[PDB]
């Protein structure tokens, strides 16, 4: 299941991220909640703009409902875990990737769908990496269960985004691969490079941030 996710991504989640993540479950979960909202937002914006693309309408409308359901599920975990819904401003991740999107159609559309694929792939890999680590303490065992449950969901979302990108790309398969490889390098750098904040999709925690715990 994770084999094609790992092939598609340009790196694994660094061990530095995973070590920090277990020391700030609160930020992890609130940012997770926000990411689920953002994935619904992305899909819905696409439903507004590309009404001629009929497989995108069917698939992404379903996806946006599932993401909203994920949102409600995380909100319930927060309730149950005693976690208030604090203001956590968004990661650098999605906004940086969104800066790569080309203006010219249909490359705009294709880039957005390729980024979707990478975001969903990365989430899937990161949930997978976290789940066994969270399993090790009782107060995070329920979250681990939930993270393993999400894996199937995210894997499908990745596949769907990538399938859409493939069918609406106008040029050769080789041209698609080369563009995917460009976005892969951007995403890899966002994940592996140092990051002074901690979020679901934040990069390798900086010393500054390590000192704070
Ligand atoms: Br859009
Ligand atoms: Br629903
Ligand atoms: Br024990
Ligand atoms: Br291209
Ligand atoms: Br880097
Ligand atoms: Br932080
Ligand atoms: Fe989700
Ligand atoms: Fe998703």
TrEMBL record:
Record bears the keyword Metal-binding: yes
Binding positions (cholate): 80, 142, 152
Residue numbers binding Fe(3+) 1: 36, 67, 70, 154
Binding locations of Fe(3+) 2: 67, 120, 154, 157
Signal peptide: none
UniProt KW keywords: Metal-binding
Domain of life: Bacteria
Protein name listed in UniProt: Probably tRNA-(MS[2]IO[6]A)-hydroxylase
